[PDB]
Amino acid sequence: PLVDNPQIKSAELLRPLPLYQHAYVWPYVIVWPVFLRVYLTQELYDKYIGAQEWTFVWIISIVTFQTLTWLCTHWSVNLNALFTAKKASSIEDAQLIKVIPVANAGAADICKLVRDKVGDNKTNISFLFQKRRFLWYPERKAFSTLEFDIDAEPKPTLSKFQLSRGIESEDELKRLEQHYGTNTFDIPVPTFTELFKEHAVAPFFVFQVFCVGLWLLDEYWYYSLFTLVMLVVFESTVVWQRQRTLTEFRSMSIKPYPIYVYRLGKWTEIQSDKLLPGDLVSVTRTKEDSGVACDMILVEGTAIVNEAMLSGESTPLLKDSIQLRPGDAVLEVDGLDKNSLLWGGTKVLQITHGPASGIPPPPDNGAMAVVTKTGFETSQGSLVRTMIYSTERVSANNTEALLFILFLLVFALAASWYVWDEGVRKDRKRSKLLLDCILIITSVVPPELPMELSLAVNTSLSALAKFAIFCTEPFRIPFAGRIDVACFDKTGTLTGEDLVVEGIAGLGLGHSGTDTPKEADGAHTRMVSVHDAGMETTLVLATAHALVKLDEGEIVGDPMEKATLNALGWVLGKNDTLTSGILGTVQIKRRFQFSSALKRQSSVATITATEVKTGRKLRGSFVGVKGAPETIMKMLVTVPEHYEETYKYFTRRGSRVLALAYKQLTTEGELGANKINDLKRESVEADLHFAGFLVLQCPLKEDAKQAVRMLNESSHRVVMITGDNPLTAVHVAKEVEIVDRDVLILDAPEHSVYGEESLVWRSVDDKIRIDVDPTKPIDPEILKTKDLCVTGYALNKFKGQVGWKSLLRYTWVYARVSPKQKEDILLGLKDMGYYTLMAGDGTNDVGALKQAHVGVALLNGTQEDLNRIAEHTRNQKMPTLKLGDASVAAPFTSKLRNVMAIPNILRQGRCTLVATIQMYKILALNCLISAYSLSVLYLEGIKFGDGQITISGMLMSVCFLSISRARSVEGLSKERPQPNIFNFYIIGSILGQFAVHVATLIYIAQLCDQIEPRTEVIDLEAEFKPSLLNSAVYLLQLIQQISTFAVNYQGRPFRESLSENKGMFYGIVGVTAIAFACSTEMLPELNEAMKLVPFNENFKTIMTTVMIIDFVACYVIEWVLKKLFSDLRARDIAERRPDQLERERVRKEKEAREK
Ligand code: ALF
Ligand SMILES: [Ca+2]
Ligand SMILES: [Mg+2]
């Protein structure tokens, strides 16, 4: 293979051809002078030198052939490589290379090779594909990505980075600059011309232009020019709207910032753009709206960072140096060196200083680090590349449309063959025969299909703006009608980012006055605010934290600690001080931390509390601990009588409860220096007391439960993908009723041996623990009894084995997944056969948002902020929202924080999915009657009047415009709409209705010929004359055109009813009433109004009978074929157990009885 990248499937070297050797110029140069000579001076009519119709046919044919030969190089890259290039012999003369990627990872392309000359008189051959560099390696004679110092076949020794210095000499700097490039992101941001060029090449636009050009034979310039002008205006405004919304939602701007680099033995100030792998950079605090420029490894110093891009959370992480490690291989994947790597894109919250290479300290007093990657090869470079180079634009050009056009073209060719044969048997003029064949060919295949689908989509696009839900690709709305799996994020989508504190309860335990309210089992539900709390609870809350105050006054730490400190009201100060209703001073000396084992935070301090209520004074040493109720129960010496039951009620009703405890070490005096250091964790937990139960409200949006419940019972499956801990993910997923059963977490053992690999089925309570290996099937029983929660660490161990497909069907919760793993799940679900939706807000789910069929990016705005922005803009004509990165990669964008915008889009999908489907069916019917009205009826003497066709045309236009516009129904239904158009039901219904219409027309024509015989000749140029046959055929055609609209219209569970459609119902009623009144002949003036012949008494009953028979037969055929072959059932992954259905029915009945 040429390219050694799994992204690239195949490659081929090419060499360009000159302009005169192309495949669409040279045959034209051969052909054109021959025809010119024949038409000009041959004087022999081999190609009809004098006939105007034949010469025009030749000119149009040759021009169309040349235009198609030119356009075929734009719709494919194989034809581009076969028409405008030749296969090169080797790399010596090759200049262009054609690259094709994996079918689900981009688009094919043909790139240009570039050769650069290094100072050592050598040649470097490279090419750029999807803004990614590829180099030609002659040692293995292939193409590779690049070779960095961090990644190599032998793992580098730590002495390479510990003793590293800056890049010396100008030659090395120039070589690195010309070999690795600059550290920047080059977004092309195309202009209007490129967008219009891309839009005007699409096959539907070419088809419409060709049809309109064919309408220039004898229809005169009136109809063709107006249609062409409106088409050009519509395409121009579509392109302008697309470019405007692309510029509004997609910016992708990164501003460089100055940094200090140790180059040539001195510290200089360099912009962040000019950085090369091997520099010695000094990192400091990262300001607002900025991040780390390049991927680097820390050498000296400690950094507190905020990795909000990879994990998705906001908990600060601690990264240590590498100075305390000997010469060893870099274990950067999972070893001790993973905590030393500093990724590019995160923010450095704090820098702590505390060298082997003898380097002077930087002037800005930062931390030394060595760059390892730069440019588009960093961690966020892959996300930026997948933002814009992952999927193709979705438009009206589908395979279903092509098959539909081919079907109608087959019928058109049959009709044209019949017309041409009957016209050549009678030896008529070839001009009128050819014009009629062209007319029926253009009439059968509808040129109005794309401009009707576009209107049906733009109506939904305009209707979606009321919920502040903007869209970028409008043709993805029908995909929302067949959604089978709907994933969800956790930290930004369902759970609210902010946190509130309800208060502290359980302080009435121990001695009770029988006055506080109690539950049925005796649980104390007394709620006391923190401002009215006791002295002991405040003292414990003022020391059991882990927050640290920066030099500029900012504070960092856990969100719950910040929330409880804000609720406390005390103020943190330097040297670990807590100052001021207690109005005391707390000085914390020693602190203890937890790492998910023995979950409790302990601290010691010196306290001076001057109570204002009781007027007492407290001073001296103090010990405060905060943790789980079970651990405090284990370490308690005087357990209250209702301690066990008073927290179960709180933790059951969606809340987080934490127990607090205190210990008075020395009442008088302080412990002093060199005394707390020798104390261990077990020593301070000898005796404990009880202070209270801090209760925190469950972080969840008020619309989360309602939206998930609406999605669950509407034949959709809701899964959840998050990068948080499995415990919190399982708790949140159980609260919103995503999973309601026993939950098993497949993950590494909690012992964390870190040396051997193992997979176990843990539980929420450590009572079930079995061993599973990734090379065997999962279980025949686990997938049936208990639900699953597969973590992201063990997802890679199951990649490629036989258990991968079993773990993509019976799992609903994924926890701790990398940004790359968030799209593997969606790709697997898409390849399995399901449609997927995903809603998220962060930067880690960019690839998942791109690879899903429809993606929503929920922002953090509110209605009041939107109103303020609108009124500020209005005042400018006479606050802001953070766009982020998720809105760039998501086709949809909801500007409101409500998660109810996720079901609403679905409510606006089905109405677009149903209507479009109906359109297809109805169009097919009108593309089959007309083919019968121009091939068999045209050859007879049946010709309608000039005034009668206007009514039919107006009725058809009104009905089509009313069908294209649609409105949404109130609530989601259990039955799904028809997915595609090429199943047995649609084709069977179309063919049955066409057969009924043909049989009725044949019977009416036969009986009308029997009643009134014809003895004259059939004239194809005679004008309109009133007769029985013309009136009968006109009435039957009007009734059939009414029946094609009043039978194939379904709107009961997915749209508005036919009675509420004012545009269509009134027209249908009026036309049907007029036709039936003229058939039954109750108004003699009406028949004379539009040139009708008086009817016999016996013919009237036959006419009414056949009209009613036609209507009833069409309705019965449609109903039977809908009842027999409807694909209205739910998918296999969305099946609901009887228990869930029974619970839903019980809840619905209770709500109905309540109201
Ligand atoms: F809320 Al996440 F990855 F868990 F964006
Ligand atoms: Ca038509
Ligand atoms: Mg998030």
Side-chain angles (χ1 to χ4, degrees), residues 596 599 727 748-753 760 762-763 766 769:
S596 302
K599 20 194 82 163
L727 290 196
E750 264 177 344
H751 184 258
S752 193
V753 72
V760 296
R762 265 188 302 114
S763 197
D766 264 34
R769 205 203 154 265

Side-chain angles (χ1 to χ4, degrees), residues 312-313 489-493 497 822 840-845:
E313 289 289 312
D489 214 40
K490 181 194 102 77
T491 290
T493 297
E497 272 269 31
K822 255 184 168 146
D841 81 313
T843 321
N844 43 6
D845 37 40

Side-chain angles (χ1 to χ4, degrees), residues 661-876:
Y662 88 106
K663 162 75 160 60
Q664 195 76 44
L665 209 62
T666 67
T667 312
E668 181 95 30
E670 327 297 320
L671 227 55
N674 214 3
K675 200 51 195 33
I676 319 88
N677 321 91
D678 48 78
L679 310 179
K680 72 209 200 298
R681 219 170 176 118
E682 295 267 337
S683 57
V684 285
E685 306 293 326
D687 181 83
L688 282 96
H689 287 54
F690 182 47
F693 273 128
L694 182 68
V695 177
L696 309 109
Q697 193 190 270
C698 190
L700 254 177
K701 294 175 174 171
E702 287 92 331
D703 315 71
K705 186 173 300 184
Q706 178 185 353
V708 172
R709 214 143 54 181
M710 197 155 37
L711 286 193
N712 260 339
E713 63 191 20
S714 303
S715 283
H716 303 288
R717 184 49 93 186
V718 172
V719 315
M720 157 167 148
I721 308 166
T722 170
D724 211 340
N725 300 328
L727 290 196
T728 317
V730 154
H731 165 258
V732 171
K734 192 192 300 293
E735 272 315 300
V736 299
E737 267 149 1
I738 276 185
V739 51
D740 41 285
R741 227 150 83 175
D742 267 42
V743 180
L744 282 173
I745 323 171
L746 166 152
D747 208 7
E750 264 177 344
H751 184 258
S752 193
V753 72
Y754 252 111
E756 299 177 349
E757 51 96 8
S758 177
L759 256 62
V760 296
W761 286 100
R762 265 188 302 114
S763 197
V764 283
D765 38 16
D766 264 34
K767 293 322 269 184
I768 300 189
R769 205 203 154 265
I770 81 173
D771 293 355
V772 58
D773 65 89
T775 199
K776 283 307 282 320
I778 322 293
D779 210 277
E781 194 262 329
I782 289 289
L783 310 171
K784 199 170 61 185
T785 322
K786 307 180 170 67
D787 281 41
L788 264 66
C789 169
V790 162
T791 40
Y793 155 76
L795 253 200
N796 53 69
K797 296 207 152 24
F798 260 111
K799 183 99 54 179
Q801 324 287 331
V802 79
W804 178 259
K805 281 196 175 183
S806 286
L807 253 49
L808 281 198
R809 158 80 197 280
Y810 294 97
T811 71
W812 326 116
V813 178
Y814 301 95
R816 231 168 43 215
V817 285
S818 41
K820 183 53 175 89
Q821 262 152 344
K822 255 184 168 146
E823 91 181 21
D824 259 357
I825 292 148
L826 277 186
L827 276 195
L829 285 175
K830 198 163 103 155
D831 282 10
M832 177 166 316
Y834 308 136
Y835 284 77
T836 38
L837 170 142
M838 171 143 188
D841 81 313
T843 321
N844 43 6
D845 37 40
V846 157
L849 257 49
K850 269 305 264 207
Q851 299 283 350
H853 282 114
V854 53
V856 196
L858 304 180
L859 294 198
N860 213 262
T862 168
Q863 193 68 71
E864 285 84 358
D865 271 358
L866 289 178
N867 285 356
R868 293 325 106 175
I869 289 172
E871 75 96 13
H872 159 266
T873 303
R874 178 165 44 88
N875 292 355
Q876 178 262 349

Side-chain angles (χ1 to χ4, degrees), residues 470-488:
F470 300 95
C471 183
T472 304
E473 295 169 12
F475 271 94
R476 259 166 207 274
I477 308 179
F479 286 144
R482 325 151 52 190
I483 289 307
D484 305 343
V485 171
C487 322
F488 272 105

